[PDB]
Design a protein around this ligand. Structure first.
Ligand SMILES: Cc1cc2nc3c(=O)[nH]c(=O)nc-3n(C[C@H](O)[C@H](O)[C@H](O)COP(=O)(O)OP(=O)(O)OC[C@H]3O[C@@H](n4cnc5c(N)ncnc54)[C@H](O)[C@@H]3O)c2cc1C
Ligand SMILES: Cc1cc2nc3c(=O)[nH]c(=O)nc-3n(C[C@H](O)[C@H](O)[C@H](O)COP(=O)(O)OP(=O)(O)OC[C@H]3O[C@@H](n4cnc5c(N)ncnc54)[C@H](O)[C@@H]3O)c2cc1C
Ligand SMILES: NC(=O)c1ccc[n+]([C@@H]2O[C@H](COP(=O)([O-])OP(=O)(O)OC[C@H]3O[C@@H](n4cnc5c(N)ncnc54)[C@H](O)[C@@H]3O)[C@@H](O)[C@H]2O)c1
Ligand SMILES: NC(=O)c1ccc[n+]([C@@H]2O[C@H](COP(=O)([O-])OP(=O)(O)OC[C@H]3O[C@@H](n4cnc5c(N)ncnc54)[C@H](O)[C@@H]3O)[C@@H](O)[C@H]2O)c1
Ligand SMILES: [Cl-]
Ligand SMILES: [Cl-]
Ligand SMILES: [Cl-]
Ligand SMILES: [Cl-]
Ligand SMILES: [Cl-]
Ligand SMILES: [Cl-]
Ligand SMILES: [Cl-]
Ligand SMILES: [Cl-]
Ligand code: NI
Ligand code: NI
Ligand code: NI
Ligand code: NI
Lengths: 452, 451
């Protein structure tokens, strides 16, 4: 009730990770969770999406099979969801049991700080030497007229039936992944975005290639399209832009970012520093401004990814409970995959970023090609790759790929980039043939040198 | 006739590569080819096999689709053959045109040395300052009774119709790849192997997992099985082990190694050292014992891979024609993929090799799991992975993976291993989630420690 070494607020990626490691160092751990263990990722994030992603991968596969002489003949969405939910349910079940197995005290409900070192959960108060905030986020629904006519990614994973005509508002990760899933399943898919290109945070080569692939797949896009309101039309719902432009959808999905769950956490009661956008500032070691209070995962405003939350959690527990006083996560060169169809992946800096952060010091290599996966198909999606290099030695500061296999391609490259790999390091590595990844180690002439 | 800077013998991976780079450095280049440009890889190796591998990936995708709610569905082999060959043709055509574009003097026919710096092709003699031998290999057909009833991998890519009941003799690369192609196309396949495990050269964990995957997909295997002869039976041909065991097959495929094309090459006449197995010894810079004569690719008896022949050739051209007098290929840690279903991949040393070369100093990490690719399927193939580490610092000396995605997974890991990555280097890099590769950077407790 006061004798806990650790209270982890939130049983998602970060909370589970720090609770787990702490418990393994023989600490007394309390874990607070208002909903289901596993958090966003297991329930409404990474896992349901990747399961649905395989279904779309397999659907593309049955379309392309006759081209290779494989005689194949459409989605049963209820069966997909049922299978997906059984699988997700099993991971929830694992975690429920694992937490009990570790000896962690689970507390159901919504935790709020009551002071610098105590929380209250449905009237019950609990103190600890260390309180870790890992409450994650939730999808943003804009304060616009008729915004409630649209659903979010949470709503997407709740859908019991496949919608026929979809509008996706936002072209970040989830907007693009949702678009690719649904079009692959044969829905009409339009995506709209504020920006002049899809996947704005990513390198212009990936953005451009993705657009081509998406256009080729029949996905309608509208760039520089600000949604002013959503309205009800004759059997369906309509998007209304700034200028008055109208768009008959049976589903409109808001994919315009996520907000941190820090609104009534009692942070002011505890004197915890928090930004106007709800992000909780931390140092490199997840320390907030209040000693004994830490934040990790999405609410910290750094790379919004599951393995980032986990790693941040494990290292924090190592720091606090294993006397590894200098232990921290490195937030440079975190690899990521966007599960489009075909998917994309990157580690490190895009060209514009590297040009921002470093000078006119960039040597940039790139290539485009149709992979052998589509050799016997009519119009396969193009693969595109860019190596961003910096300095005379050509340190590789960015690796960017879009195309078949990209989802499994960059993990090892992330290792090399973290080790400070140069172009030479890549080039002295013998290719694997035949495949796509070999293209990253056989780039010859650069497209841009310092001066461009 | 004698004013050539380079004669490349063989228009395969090594010959093309050295000729191209020499030509690019403004040298006068002759390229001798007796058959088609592109060599083995383009015509009867990597490319046809990978084309068919995709058909096989798609057939499996077709099988698995209903489990994921995708309402699907059987191979039209002629359609596959026609598509494959058309794709192959384009690459040959590219090379034909490319060699002409580079200004290389192509010469059709079989080259033999006449002296240390001269070759003869169908009567014409040609000298050069530099002669690169890159004549590659050919499948081995053993000198057993009725060996000729079987076919080779060359014969596999010549087949116009899908065989119904196939025997694969050999559990190296080719045997395994072919077995997996055929089985997913619905043929009956049994593979026999001299060794006690499939893919002997590979790490036991890969071998053991591949056996499991292959058994689960209906492939029958016979280990420690030495075929003594092939005889005709009542429709089909039979395998006879030397103990007497008998196996009725539609086609029998020898996949028992490849022999170097160096028997009728005039190496005697030029004074070039050759081993009894036909391999041509070289130093680290591809130099034979006679100055001006070099060898690369398969006949050198090093890693028998396309990109290895290519890199060796390019680097040799840089050495010879661009004053980069120290340029050579590093033969340590060549990554490779074996295109089974699902494929496997490795870079560096297996556990047995590492103990053999480095001693009782290994920290070995292992994991095994069913990837999310098979989440809604009944019995997906296993994925298995091993990190082989050496020393107290735990340098990564071996990386090994079998399973979905293995074919695109290890290229970047090869770079890291090339740089001398340790386990710490792996663990300090954040995982990509969700996927399989992340398992390689999140291996916690080792299975074996020094001792
Ligand atoms: C659709 C979608 C797809 C995604 N795909 C990927 C992907 O493929 N790869 C990847 O790496 N990342 C992906 N992410 C991001 C990833 O899910 C998050 O980065 C990760 O879950 C963050 O973990 P966390 O611990 O910070 O927050 P969460 O995992 O969301 O955990 C927070 C938990 O705390 C609980 N909680 C909140 N407030 C309280 C309270 N005050 N008291 C008690 N409990 C509380 C919540 O119920 C929640 O369970 C995806 C996200 C979305 C939405
Ligand atoms: C079935 C199979 C699958 C394979 N799969 C892969 C794989 O996926 N990945 C990979 O990296 N490697 C693979 N390989 C191995 C790869 O093909 C070889 O390592 C590569 O082709 C070797 O190149 P090379 O230049 O040494 O020989 P080759 O490419 O075989 O070139 C030799 C050429 O020389 C010609 N020649 C021979 N004698 C003479 C003569 N005296 N005069 C003139 N010309 C002559 C031949 O016609 C031939 O064209 C595979 C091989 C096989 C057979
Ligand atoms: N595969 C993965 O690793 C994975 C998958 C999904 C999400 N994630 C994580 O979760 C986060 C989720 O971000 P997100 O994709 O929801 O959004 P985002 O922040 O990445 O993108 C913002 C988008 O909102 C749009 N937008 C905002 N207001 C608009 C308006 N009124 N009209 C039209 N468009 C408007 C903009 O056009 C913009 O494209 C990501 O940052 C990522 O880190 C990861
Ligand atoms: N994916 C790729 O990178 C790829 C694919 C295929 C081949 N290759 C290359 O080509 C080379 C040749 O491959 P390979 O598989 O033909 O050779 P191999 O040396 O790997 O095959 C040896 C096999 O021959 C068998 N064998 C020999 N005599 C036998 C007997 N009488 N009875 C039963 N079994 C017998 C053994 O059991 C053994 O399994 C490889 O070294 C490889 O580098 C590469
Ligand atoms: Cl236990
Ligand atoms: Cl409440
Ligand atoms: Cl909240
Ligand atoms: Cl896909
Ligand atoms: Cl030109
Ligand atoms: Cl002849
Ligand atoms: Cl010969
Ligand atoms: Cl496969
Ligand atoms: Ni207490
Ligand atoms: Ni107090
Ligand atoms: Ni001459
Ligand atoms: Ni002479």
């Amino acid at each position: 009730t006061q004798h806990f070494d650790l209270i982890a607020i939130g049983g998602g990626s970060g909370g589970l990770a720090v609770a787990e490691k702490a418990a393994a160092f023989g600490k007394r751990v309390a874990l607070i969770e208002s909903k289901a263990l596993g958090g966003t990722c297991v329930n409404v994030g990474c896992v349901p999406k990747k399961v649905m992603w395989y279904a779309s991968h397999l659907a593309e596969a049955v379309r392309d099979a006759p081209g290779f002489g494989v005689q194949a003949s459409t989605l049963d969405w209820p069966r997909l969801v049922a299978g997906r939910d059984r699988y997700i349910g099993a991971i929830n079940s694992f975690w429920d049991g694992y937490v009990e197995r570790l000896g962690i005290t689970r507390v159901d409900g919504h935790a709020r700080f009551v002071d610098a070192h105590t929380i209250e959960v449905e009237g019950q108060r609990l103190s600890a030497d260390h309180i870790v905030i890992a409450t994650g986020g939730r999808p943003i629904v804009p304060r616009l007229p008729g915004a409630e006519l649209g659903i979010t990614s949470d709503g997407f994973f709740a859908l019991q039936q496949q919608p026929k005509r979809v509008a996706i508002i936002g072209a970040g990760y989830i907007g693009i992944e949702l678009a690719g899933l649904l079009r692959s399943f044969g829905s009409e898919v339009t995506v709209v975005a504020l920006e002049d290109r899809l996947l704005f945070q990513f390198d212009p080569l990936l953005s451009a290639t993705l657009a081509e692939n998406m256009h080729a797949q029949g996905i309608e896009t509208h760039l520089e399209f600000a949604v002013a309101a959503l309205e009800r039309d004759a059997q369906g719902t309509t998007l209304v832009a700034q200028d008055g432009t109208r768009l008959g959808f049976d589903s409109v999905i808001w994919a315009v970012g996520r907000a941190p769950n820090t609104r009534d956490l009692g942070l002011e009661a505890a004197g915890i520093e928090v930004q106007s956008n709800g992000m909780v500032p931390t140092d490199a070691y997840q320390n907030t401004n209040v000693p004994g209070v830490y934040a990790l995962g999405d609410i910290t405003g750094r790379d919004q990814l599951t393995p980032v939350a986990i790693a941040a959690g494990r290292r924090l527990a190592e720091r606090l409970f294993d006397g590894q006083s200098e232990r921290k996560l490195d937030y440079d060169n975190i690899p990521t995959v966007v599960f489009a169809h075909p998917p994309l992946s990157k580690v490190g800096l895009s060209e514009p970023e590297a040009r921002e952060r470093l000078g006119d010091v960039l040597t940039v290599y790139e290539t485009s090609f149709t992979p052998m996966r589509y050799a016997l198909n009519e119009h396969g999606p193009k693969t595109a790759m860019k190596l961003v290099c910096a300095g005379p030695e050509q340190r590789v500061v960015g690796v960017h790929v879009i195309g078949d296999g990209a989802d499994e391609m960059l993990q090892g490259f992330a290792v090399a980039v973290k080790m400070g790999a140069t172009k030479a390091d890549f080039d002295n590595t013998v290719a694997i043939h035949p495949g796509s990844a070999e293209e990253l180690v056989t780039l010859k002439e650069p497209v841009r040198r310092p001066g461009d």
